[PDB]
Amino acid sequence: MIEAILFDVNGTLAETEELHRRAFNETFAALGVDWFWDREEYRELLTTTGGKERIARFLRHQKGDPAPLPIADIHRAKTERFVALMAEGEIALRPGIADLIAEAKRAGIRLAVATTTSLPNVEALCRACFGHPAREIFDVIAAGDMVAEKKPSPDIYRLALRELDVPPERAVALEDSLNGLRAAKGAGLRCIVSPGFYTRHEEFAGADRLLDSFAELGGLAGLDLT
Ligand SMILES: O=C(COP(=O)(O)O)[C@@H](O)[C@H](O)COP(=O)(O)O
Ligand SMILES: [Mg+2]
């Protein structure tokens, strides 16, 4: 029925994108460039997953300061800032997530992360939100540049499934975004979508369930869809 649950990270485990946006903007300020992404701009840029990819897209169009460093270096600084901001301890898990995970663990169900985000962010979020290193919560962590093409490419889900050794028909993905749903479906997975601030405007055609809150699953029971 379900032998594994695969979780997206940003927008799914926790509402994190405003902290990402802060970490980007503060990094840009610290580099002495005039770049600044407000919510309207960030909503658009969020359709490109991966922070390096997002910076690259922004730089193709923007008419402010030229990049002073390679994008990888800008993004590495932004990651360090995000890890630091996460440690402060303001971020909570989305409703239903903590209970679902604890319930899955009691039931012996294997858990993965499949995310476009940088690996240190996963670690930082798990310390802050669960109080544990990521590998104590998730049996498999597929993140960041572990694949060459990010969501909507299914590669990150295919990596996670290969490491889980669970066929997709015995697993399910939880996502918040359209590119996430596309990726999970591309790996042959049932996908439960609950959007947030930045993704509620999207069309979720093909989602197995579209929910206002992951608490609406009622835990493990709600996962085993047709
Ligand atoms: O598109 C993304 C969504 O992550 P998820 O797949 O977990 O929803 C990421 O790029 C984050 O916006 C920022 O994280 P990085 O800057 O580390 O890429
Ligand atoms: Mg997400």
Swiss-Prot record:
Mg(2+) binds at residues 8, 10, 176. It is an enzyme of class 3 (hydrolase). Its EC number is 3.1.3.-. It comes from the Bacteria. Substrate binds at residues 8, 17, 50-54, 75-78, 115-121. The active site is at 8 (nucleophile), 10 (proton donor). This is Protein CbbY.
